[PDB]
Design a protein around this ligand. Structure first.
Ligand SMILES: *C/C=C1/C(=C/c2[nH]c(/C=C3[NH+]=C(/C=C4\NC(=O)C(C=C)=C4C)C(C)=C\3CCC(=O)O)c(CCC(=O)O)c2C)NC(=O)[C@H]1C
Length: 305
């Protein structure tokens, strides 16, 4: 089973117990956005990232207890209608907020809790190219090139899982001067079993700055349940420190991947690196999620034949 998280007396993770880290409930976020949680009926703000004033203009203890009807009067009715009790936790409400300076708002529901993420914000020929690839290798090449053109990332790989969960870079698009990873293979423990399971359900994750300290969510436990807040559906969730260290030792300042899912199993990842910290813009992320779904469908075809 999972260890308790660090704020419930759990141990710091080592290579002996990688698979036991409760990565879905870190009780903290990355500093390039802000996160609030709120009661799904009242809209009462229950939890606040400690950096909330940087993005929302009010300190955590001032936001606490206010309602989304007061804080987001133009969005609250639409948000309620969009995310009723019992909807899937990957269903999202999205809005673009005007702010004295836009802010992207992304909301999902887990049980009776709304999870609100705030971050700053500012193809057809490509899809046909993916469709037109005549074999799996060519498809992988086209996908990595297309994603690199979209995003500007220094490296874009297609990382394929073997049946023993080892991984291999099977295609890559890379900036001039970088080392090749093409053909290199990696142990199963580099993406441990609980991560692979999370990535079958929540199809995009990232680390915008591999040296940035996490920002606590407080109070850390959901007051509704006196239990940890599930953050697997939040892109702002803090990343495992073991993985952050892996990336720093690779010379990677920013990382992002999108799951490739075939017959309901995790086939691989579109895995991206940048040498310098880098926030992929929100609109570019949404496009990249869509390409992941389209790639997945294409891989299922090409691999059968
Ligand atoms: C004892 C635990 C270890 C461990 C844990 C860990 N790793 C991940 C997530 C990722 N690991 C990745 C690995 C690679 N990226 C590459 O570029 C290459 C090779 C060229 C490898 C082998 C990847 C792609 C991920 C996914 C996330 C990402 O795209 O940045 C997690 C989960 C992270 C999270 O979502 O919070 C964990 C717990 N990794 C180890 O190496 C050992 C130390």
């Amino acid at each position: 089973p999972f260890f308790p998280p660090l704020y419930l007396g759990g141990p710091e993770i080592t290579t002996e117990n990688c698979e036991r880290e409760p990565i879905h409930i870190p009780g903290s976020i990355q500093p390039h956005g802000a996160l609030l949680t709120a009661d799904g009926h009242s809209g009462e703000v229950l939890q606040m990232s400690l950096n909330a004033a940087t993005f929302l203009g009010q300190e955590p203890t001032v936001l606490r207890g206010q309602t989304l009807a007061a804080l987001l009067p133009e969005q609250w009715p639409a948000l309620q209608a969009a995310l009723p009790p019992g909807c899937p936790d990957a269903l999202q409400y999205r809005a673009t907020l005007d702010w004295p300076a836009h802010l992207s708002l992304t909301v999902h529901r887990v049980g009776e809790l709304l999870i609100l993420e705030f971050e700053p914000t500012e193809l057809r020929n490509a899809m046909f190219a993916l469709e037109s690839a005549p074999n799996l290798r060519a498809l992988a090449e086209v996908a990595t090139q297309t994603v690199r053109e979209l995003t500007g990332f220094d490296r874009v790989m297609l990382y394929k899982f073997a049946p023993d969960a080892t991984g291999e870079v099977i295609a890559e698009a890379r900036r001039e001067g970088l080392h090749a990873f093409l053909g290199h293979r990696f142990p199963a423990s580099d993406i441990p079993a609980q991560a692979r399971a999370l990535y079958t359900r929540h199809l995009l994750r990232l680390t915008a700055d591999t040296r940035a300290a996490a920002v606590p969510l407080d109070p850390v436990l959901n007051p509704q349940t006196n239990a940890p807040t599930p953050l697997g559906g939040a892109v702002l969730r803090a990343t495992s420190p073991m993985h952050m260290q892996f990336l720093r030792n690779m010379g990677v300042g920013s990382s992002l991947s999108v799951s490739v899912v075939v017959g309901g199993q995790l086939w691989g990842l579109i895995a991206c690196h940048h040498q310098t910290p880098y926030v992929l813009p929100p609109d570019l992320r949404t496009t990249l999620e869509y390409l992941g779904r389209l790639l997945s469908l294409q891989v299922q075809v090409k691999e059968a034949l």
